[PDB]
Amino acid sequence: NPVPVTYPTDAYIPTYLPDDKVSNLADLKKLIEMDSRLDLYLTRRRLDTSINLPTNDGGKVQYSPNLATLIGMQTGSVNDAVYSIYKYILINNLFVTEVKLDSLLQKVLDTNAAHLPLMNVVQTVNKLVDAEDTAKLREITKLALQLNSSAQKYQFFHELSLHPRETLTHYLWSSKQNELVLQGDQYFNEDAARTSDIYSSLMGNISLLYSQ
């Protein structure tokens, strides 16, 4: 899960500006898409796969003379041990698909059950042996919001040129409907709520409360 942050990470980079007055905006879109393709190639090579130790201080382990018959070697890392043991369980077709233990596995495991899960098999196997990019991504997302602000002011004044009668009545109604919201919490301030001046709808409320 991705961690939530306290600052905006990206911006939409609006596209309602006239593409015949402001130029090179398509250049910006091409550059952003190219950077979006220049890191999909990096994240891929961060999950890169490598095959460097099929067979090839605590990285080297001496195997027992018993397990040395299922490996072909007497020393090597633990990775080679678990891998070659799995390869031996796979080549001889021992998994039940119609693990069924072989004859030499009886000795290497010191078990006569002749049938054991693979989990226990590898259990016995063990038993036998960066900062500047954040500033750049905040500086860029600090300009695509300034662009997203100037574009909004252009959108407002351009939509004011066309239909000014429609925008002005909206501004006057937003004003007459927002100056009322901001003047709704000036009644409770602890220096005008104990002076008995606002207690002489705070009277029908006590009727509803007492009934409640």
Binding site: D35, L38, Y41, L42, N52, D133, K136, I140
Partner: protein
């Protein structure tokens, strides 16, 4: 443009890292090929010497 050059030098480094990884699959596979050739030769000599003896 500056962020692009920043994410571009990463590729400039990754190219050398990839070609170095590629140069590790030519000096290592041929070693196993030579080991297999030596193994087949000495196993031929060993099986011949074994057949010379009574046990076979």
């Amino acid at each position: 443009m500056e962020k692009l050059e920043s994410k571009f030098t990463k590729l400039c480094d990754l190219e050398t890292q990839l070609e170095m990884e590629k140069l590790k699959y030519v000096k290592e596979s041929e070693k196993m090929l030579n080991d297999r050739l030596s193994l087949s030769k000495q196993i031929l000599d060993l099986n011949k010497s074994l057949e010379e003896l009574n046990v076979s």
